[PDB]
Amino acid sequence: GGDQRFGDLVFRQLAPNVWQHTSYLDMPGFGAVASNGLIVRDGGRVLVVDTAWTDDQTAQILNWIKQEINLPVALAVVTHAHQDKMGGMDALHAAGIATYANALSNQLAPQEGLVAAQHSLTFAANGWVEPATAPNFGPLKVFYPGPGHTSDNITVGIDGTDIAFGGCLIKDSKAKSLGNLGDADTEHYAASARAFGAAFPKASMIVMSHSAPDSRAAITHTARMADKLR
Length: 230
Ligand SMILES: C[C@H](CS)C(=O)N1CCC[C@H]1C(=O)O
Ligand SMILES: [Zn+2]
Ligand SMILES: [Zn+2]
Fold this sequence. Notes:
Blueprint: E1 4-6, E2 9-15, E3 18-27, E4 31-42, E5 45-49, H1 55-68, E6 73-78, H2 83-86, H3 89-94, E7 98-102, H4 103-108, E8 119-121, E9 140-143, E10 155-158, E11 163-165, H5 189-199, E12 205-207, H6 217-227
Parallel strand pairs: 5-6, 6-7, 7-8, 11-12
Antiparallel strand pairs: 1-2, 2-3, 3-4, 4-5, 9-10, 10-11
Bound molecules: L-captopril and zinc ion (2 copies).
Function: Confers resistance to the different beta-lactams antibiotics (penicillin, cephalosporin and carbapenem) via the hydrolysis of the beta-lactam ring. Does not confer resistance to the polymixin colistin or the fluoroquinolone ciprofloxacin.
Binding site for Zn(2+) 2: 84, 168, 210
Subcellular location: Periplasm
């Protein structure tokens, strides 16, 4: 279709200023598993959502940005303390990029075998990021929907687009399962999925970690599967 290959990664333009990055990691019982994040150009800078699985892959994301956009990466926000989302933090840091995560992600990252972000986000009781903790986030709208896939999972909308990113909270409309639930909050998951949908009620393109972009039926379907856990 429109997928651009760059080394071992894939880049898909979703909107004029927005690309999805995709990287892969072998896992037993699963094969080579895709993880998606985002790249957003905001004026004269670039914003990244999530690393790739590894430092090397993350450096390749930066190389793609250099080749295709050739503007500084002002910051990255990473959406929970798992390897697919934070595996590449040292590559961002080597590159001089300021990093942000949920406070709880930074607290958990060491024991997860991950490097913490440099800056912690905290969230109002209504789930919206406290805006003073997310300086220079431009069009990124960061929302904590409650515990679900993990206790620390956060989501991101993009102002001026029809896109909302569910990270590993949301699976596609035909997904057979919710994946590994080892760190999940099975009581709260369905509500958290629905809270994501309600935070971004206008988004028609739902982007997520482990499926291609889908309609909002991804949210309804994920929530319906999560209903079965409680
Ligand atoms: C390591 C990642 C973190 S979200 C994971 O748990 N995955 C990646 C694909 C599905 C699921 C699994 O192993 O069940
Ligand atoms: Zn995860
Ligand atoms: Zn994941």
